[PDB]
Amino acid sequence: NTFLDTIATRFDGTHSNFVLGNAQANGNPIVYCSDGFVDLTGYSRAQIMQKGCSCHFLYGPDTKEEHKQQIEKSLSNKMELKLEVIFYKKEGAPFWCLFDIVPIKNEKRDVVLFLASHKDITH
Numbered sequence: 001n002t003f004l005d006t007i008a009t010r011f012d013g014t015h016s017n018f019v020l021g022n023a024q025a026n027g028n029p030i031v032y033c034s035d036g037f038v039d040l041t042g043y044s045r046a047q048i049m050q051k052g053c054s055c056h057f058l059y060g061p062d063t064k065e066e067h068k069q070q071i072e073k074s075l076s077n078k079m080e081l082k083l084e085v086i087f088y089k090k091e092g093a094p095f096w097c098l099f100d101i102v103p104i105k106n107e108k109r110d111v112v113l114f115l116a117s118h119k120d121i122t123h
């Protein structure tokens with residue numbers, strides 16, 4: 001199977017919140033998102049499928065600038081990131097998110113995807 005299919009399938013049945021971004025396309029576009037991520041954020045899959053893995057569409061007033069920078073650098077340098085950051089749902093409700101990005105490499109050791117997952121840690 002392809003990397004996109006293979007990675008998504010790994011999480012079947014876990015009800016995880018995650019997206020897959022295409023690292024070989026400008027802007028690192030989201031090319032897949034789980035049902036859990038749809039429910040978490042309040043955005044439809046259709047809306048999410050026109051957004052970037054940086055998850056800029058989740059930024060709001062209290063989203064720290066330094067956190068936005070960390071995310072940009074992670075994606076730009078194609079490196080891992082584990083970050084506690086305030087994100088905003090579709091209707092504006094804020095939530096604390098543990099944002100986890102890992103670069104996915106192919107058989108040639110080239111980064112072809114980003115796996116980015118989201119844990120609601122507002123608790």
